[PDB]
Amino acid sequence: QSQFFIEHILQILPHRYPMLLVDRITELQANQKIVAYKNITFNEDVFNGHFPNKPIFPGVLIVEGMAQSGGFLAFTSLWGFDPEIAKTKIVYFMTIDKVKFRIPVTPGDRLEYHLEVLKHKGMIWQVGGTAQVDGKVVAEAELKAMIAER
Amino acid sequence: QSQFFIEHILQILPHRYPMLLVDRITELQANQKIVAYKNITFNEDVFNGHFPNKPIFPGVLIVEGMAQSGGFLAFTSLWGFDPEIAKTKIVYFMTIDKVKFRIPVTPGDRLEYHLEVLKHKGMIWQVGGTAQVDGKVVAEAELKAMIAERE
Amino acid sequence: QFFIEHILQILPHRYPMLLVDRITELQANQKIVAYKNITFNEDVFNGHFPNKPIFPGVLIVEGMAQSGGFLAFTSLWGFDPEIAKTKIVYFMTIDKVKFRIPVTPGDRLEYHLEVLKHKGMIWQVGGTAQVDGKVVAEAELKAMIAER
Amino acid sequence: SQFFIEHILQILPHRYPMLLVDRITELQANQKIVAYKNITFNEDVFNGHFPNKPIFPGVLIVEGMAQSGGFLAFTSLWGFDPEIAKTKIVYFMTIDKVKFRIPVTPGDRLEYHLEVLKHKGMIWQVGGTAQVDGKVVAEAELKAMIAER
Amino acid sequence: LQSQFFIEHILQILPHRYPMLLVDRITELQANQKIVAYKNITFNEDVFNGHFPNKPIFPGVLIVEGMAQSGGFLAFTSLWGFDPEIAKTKIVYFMTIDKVKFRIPVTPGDRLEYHLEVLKHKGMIWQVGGTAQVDGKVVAEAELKAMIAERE
Amino acid sequence: QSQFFIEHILQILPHRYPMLLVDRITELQANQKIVAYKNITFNEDVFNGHFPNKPIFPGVLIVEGMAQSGGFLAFTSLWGFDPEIAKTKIVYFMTIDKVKFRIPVTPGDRLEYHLEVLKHKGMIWQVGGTAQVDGKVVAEAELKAMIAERE
Numbered sequence: 087q088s089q090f091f092i093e094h095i096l097q098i099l100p101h102r103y104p105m106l107l108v109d110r111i112t113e114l115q116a117n118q119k120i121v122a123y124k125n126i127t128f129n130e131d132v133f134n135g136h137f138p139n140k141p142i143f144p145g146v147l148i149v150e151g152m153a154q155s156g157g158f159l160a161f162t163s164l165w166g167f168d169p170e171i172a173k174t175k176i177v178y179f180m181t182i183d184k185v186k187f188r189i190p191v192t193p194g195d196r197l198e199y200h201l202e203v204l205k206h207k208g209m210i211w212q213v214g215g216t217a218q219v220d221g222k223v224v225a226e227a228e229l230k231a232m233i234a235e236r
Numbered sequence: 237q238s239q240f241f242i243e244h245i246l247q248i249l250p251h252r253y254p255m256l257l258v259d260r261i262t263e264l265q266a267n268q269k270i271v272a273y274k275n276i277t278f279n280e281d282v283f284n285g286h287f288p289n290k291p292i293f294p295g296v297l298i299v300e301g302m303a304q305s306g307g308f309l310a311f312t313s314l315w316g317f318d319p320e321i322a323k324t325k326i327v328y329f330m331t332i333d334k335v336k337f338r339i340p341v342t343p344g345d346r347l348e349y350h351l352e353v354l355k356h357k358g359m360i361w362q363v364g365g366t367a368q369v370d371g372k373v374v375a376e377a378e379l380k381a382m383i384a385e386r387e
Numbered sequence: 388q389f390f391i392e393h394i395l396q397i398l399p400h401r402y403p404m405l406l407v408d409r410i411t412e413l414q415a416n417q418k419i420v421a422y423k424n425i426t427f428n429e430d431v432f433n434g435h436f437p438n439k440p441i442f443p444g445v446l447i448v449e450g451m452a453q454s455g456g457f458l459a460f461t462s463l464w465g466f467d468p469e470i471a472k473t474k475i476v477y478f479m480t481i482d483k484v485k486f487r488i489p490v491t492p493g494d495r496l497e498y499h500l501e502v503l504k505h506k507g508m509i510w511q512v513g514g515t516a517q518v519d520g521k522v523v524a525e526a527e528l529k530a531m532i533a534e535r
Numbered sequence: 536s537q538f539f540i541e542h543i544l545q546i547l548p549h550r551y552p553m554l555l556v557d558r559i560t561e562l563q564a565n566q567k568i569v570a571y572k573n574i575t576f577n578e579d580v581f582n583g584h585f586p587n588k589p590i591f592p593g594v595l596i597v598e599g600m601a602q603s604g605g606f607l608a609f610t611s612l613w614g615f616d617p618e619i620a621k622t623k624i625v626y627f628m629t630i631d632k633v634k635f636r637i638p639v640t641p642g643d644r645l646e647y648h649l650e651v652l653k654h655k656g657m658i659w660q661v662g663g664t665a666q667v668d669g670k671v672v673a674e675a676e677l678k679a680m681i682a683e684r
Numbered sequence: 685l686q687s688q689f690f691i692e693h694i695l696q697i698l699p700h701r702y703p704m705l706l707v708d709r710i711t712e713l714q715a716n717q718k719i720v721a722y723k724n725i726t727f728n729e730d731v732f733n734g735h736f737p738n739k740p741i742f743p744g745v746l747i748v749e750g751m752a753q754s755g756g757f758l759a760f761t762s763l764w765g766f767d768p769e770i771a772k773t774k775i776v777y778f779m780t781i782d783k784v785k786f787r788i789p790v791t792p793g794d795r796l797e798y799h800l801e802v803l804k805h806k807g808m809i810w811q812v813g814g815t816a817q818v819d820g821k822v823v824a825e826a827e828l829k830a831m832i833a834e835r836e
Numbered sequence: 837q838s839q840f841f842i843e844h845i846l847q848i849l850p851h852r853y854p855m856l857l858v859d860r861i862t863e864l865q866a867n868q869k870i871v872a873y874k875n876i877t878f879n880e881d882v883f884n885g886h887f888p889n890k891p892i893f894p895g896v897l898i899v900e901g902m903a904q905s906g907g908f909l910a911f912t913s914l915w916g917f918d919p920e921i922a923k924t925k926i927v928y929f930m931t932i933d934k935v936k937f938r939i940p941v942t943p944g945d946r947l948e949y950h951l952e953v954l955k956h957k958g959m960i961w962q963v964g965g966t967a968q969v970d971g972k973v974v975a976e977a978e979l980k981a982m983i984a985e986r987e
């Protein structure tokens with residue numbers, strides 16, 4: 087497909103509350119790129135501690151959302167939307183590089199992940215891109231993952 | 237004076253996690269109307285139970301969100317943006333009428349509240365409006381809440 | 388009576404949105420009496436409100452809808468956990484609700500719903516929420532049972 | 536003789552999700568207390584105790600009796616005094632003769648019945664039962680120690 | 685029957701789940717005799733939000749609960765060995781708790797070690813006693829009798 | 837000093853539940869290095885979703901933990917144990933580089949943070965190091981953080 091909602095995302099990723107950080111897929115081009123996003127609301131538990139009276143979505147969780155997006159891209163590229171096969175795979179994330187945070191993310195923001203395949207050799211996938219809020223780059227990162235059996 | 241962010245909301249409304257359901261205020265007209273919104277994400281505890289495998293933002297919480305929007309409008313119309321006064325006030329729901337849910341709200345939606353003051357007298361405010369997602373009415377509601385000093 | 392275990396087999400709601408603990412009375416297509424205990428040990432109170440525990444008015448209504456939901460499921464298909472696991476419930480309308488007394492921890496929130504009208508999966512009920520014999524709230528609502 | 540959650544919050548230092556006393560229905564200084572905690576499915580504890588079979592932890596029933604006994608010990612000496620309450624801490628040294636007879640589930644009103652067995656200085660020993668609708672669901676003896684915060 | 689079991693194995697034997705599964709690993713196990721396990725204590729636990737604000741103390745009753753779960757694992761395990769399918773139909777219940785003594789407060793950063801020994805077993809009835817230790821020191825003492833019952 | 841417990845960490849770091857991922861500091865050298873750790877237990881909410889029936893501590897949270905240790909070093913380096921000045925600040929992640937995840941971290945693990953100061957000037961600190969479990973490197977990373985006025 088091209089558009090995947092939360093119910094579809096749930097069938098592909100093993101992630102669940104409170105670590106499923108991708109609400110909807112707006113664009114998906116097999117083996118090339120994925121545009122998705124996660125809404126940022128105050129009503130999230132992480133905001134209880136990050137930080138009191140100063141709600142700021144954790145930079146490491148922006149990268150996690152990006153990794154998740156990359157993982158969905160990789161998986162669908164190999165087997166498409168296949169819930170059955172999804173249950174038998176795992177995407178190990180081996181490395182993270184060139185991460186830069188330019189603007190803080192906060193409640194009310196629509197955190198949009200933009201990832202593209204940088205390299206794919208065998209079970210290894212290298213993805214990179216940015217996270218954006220209303221058109222502006224809020225962060226960037228590269229990630230390398232390996233695909234294996236669960 | 238017309239747009240407020242989560243920090244400004246925290247200084248006005250007494251609500252807190254997991255019952256602070258307004259993330260940002262986009263426009264505000266004293267004693268008249270207010271437009272605000274709350275982002276809906278899967279990463280909300282309410283979804284563990286509503287319902288398993290089928291994330292649906294609870295209709296009653298959409299109404300709560302509209303009430304809180306009215307509350308913000310009510311408080312600032314009264315004392316303006318005054319945190320020290322807001323600090324010791326709570327808000328009680330008095331009545332709810334003519335609410336209709338038209339479209340289910342799910343993760344990924346930007347729930348936009350549109351409230352207009354139908355009548356107010358002292359601490360008693362009567363608002364009515366809609367909750368919208370991508371310009372479409374997903375809910376209609378009318379409510380009356382009371383602002384009161386913690387005692 | 389129907390205890391939490393039975394309620395779980397019929398209603399699709401789960402933590403932290405399952406707000407009915409026990410069903411004390413049930414009369415098909417007529418009325419249902421049930422309740423939910425209110426204790427400080429509930430997450431909602433962390434935010435409603437700090438230093439002043441007030442059970443949310445909208446949750447009192449949710450508790451009434453669920454009570455009504457249980458009446459709809461059983462009136463429709465009897466106590467059938469199998470048919471129940473395929474359905475969910477949507478709120479359609481809420482009207483004429485009034486809150487008279489705040490519900491707080493230590494209260495036994497009793498739901499009293501009667502059937503006003505029904506047709507197919509669409510049920511309209513109304514009644515009150517009571518604490519120690521006094522009406523703390525009134526309400527009318529219409530909900531729809533659907534295939535998830 | 537009757538304290539509601541706000542009063543309880545001013546005396547006990549416990550907070551969510553460890554404040555296990557909702558209301559105090561009876562209190563005789565140096566003698567006894569009767570209080571209760573409502574049990575509802577809407578409690579986080581039930582997610583794991585246990586999945587598909589909600590049962591209020593027996594050790595949490597004891598904790599509730601401890602908190603009640605500590606509330607008794609404290610108010611007996613200083614009464615309803617929020618200010619002093621902040622300068623003291625009632626922790627427990629021992630717990631004994633505990634027995635569980637009936638499982639406590641969502642829908643039950645868990646009533647704590649503690650009495651002062653003996654006390655000397657800041658060391659108080661209470662004991663009694665946990666009851667649901669008139670029946671004994673548990674019994675226990677505890678020895679608290681009141682010290683400076 | 686092995687002597688070391690990790691969380692993956694504990695999850696298959698005990699029915700407890702978040703936030704009441706209080707045993708993270710088993711370091712030694714001896715059928716009908718004893719068990720040594722532990723639970724890591726971190727600030728990132730919901731219980732510390734209210735016990736207590738600004739002064740995180742791991743609840744004494746939870747230390748006891750942890751010892752009971754250890755004894756429970758030992759009991760079931762001594763009887764059926766590592767049998768997940770059967771474990772799934774049994775459940776251990778507290779019958780009594782006696783001689784509980786709290787000696788030292790447990791706090792975030794501590795490794796709460798459970799040392800339980802079988803004082804008497806007879807069918808589904810098990811009486812165990814032991815201590816909760818932190819860095820070699822006894823922080824708690826307890827004794828309890830449990831029952832292995834049917835889940836239905 | 838050289839060792840701080842949870843009560844000291846609370847008075848310095850702005851992080852609270854569920855994002856305070858450092859439990860104890862075992863070694864600290866002003867402007868040079870720090871060794872701290874966070875206990876890993878199944879009794880953590882994060883494990884409900886990462887992942888069901890297969891608890892693994894999130895790699896990004898391991899880095900976050902290293903960042904917090906660095907932040908604790910940075911602050912006490914410039915102000916010592918000063919709770920009054922500590923509450924007038926937060927820390928912002930600026931960059932992360934060279935992170936390798938070698939071994940999965942699970943309940944029962946004592947996640948040890950080893951960080952050294954690579955560069956530092958003003959409120960800008962650059963640290964790098966590893967996260968260890970029973971003396972084995974389970975991860976590596978470099979990061980730059982900034983201590984900023986709460987405003």
Ligand SMILES: O=C(N/N=C/c1cc(Br)c(O)c(Br)c1O)c1ccc(Cl)cc1
Nearest residue numbers: 100153154157158175176177178887890
């Ligand atoms: O160690 C694991 N790493 N990654 C799992 C995983 C799987 C997919 Br599919 C994915 O898109 C991503 Br991102 C993952 O992290 C893992 C191990 C077991 C399970 Cl059941 C799930 C995940």
Ligand SMILES: O=C(N/N=C/c1cc(Br)c(O)c(Br)c1O)c1ccc(Cl)cc1
Nearest residue numbers: 548624626684736739741786787788789
């Ligand atoms: O320190 C204990 N209990 N409570 C302590 C405590 C609580 C709050 Br509230 C407080 O502000 C402070 Br000063 C305390 O020491 C304790 C003392 C002994 C054991 Cl064996 C276990 C716990």
Ligand SMILES: [Cl-]
Nearest residue numbers: 144145928929
């Ligand atoms: Cl950050």
Ligand SMILES: [Cl-]
Nearest residue numbers: 294295477478
């Ligand atoms: Cl709904």
Ligand SMILES: [Cl-]
Nearest residue numbers: 328329443444
């Ligand atoms: Cl209300």
Ligand SMILES: [Cl-]
Nearest residue numbers: 591592593778
């Ligand atoms: Cl139990």
Ligand SMILES: [Cl-]
Nearest residue numbers: 742743744745
């Ligand atoms: Cl304790």
Ligand SMILES: [Cl-]
Nearest residue numbers: 893894895896
């Ligand atoms: Cl990971």
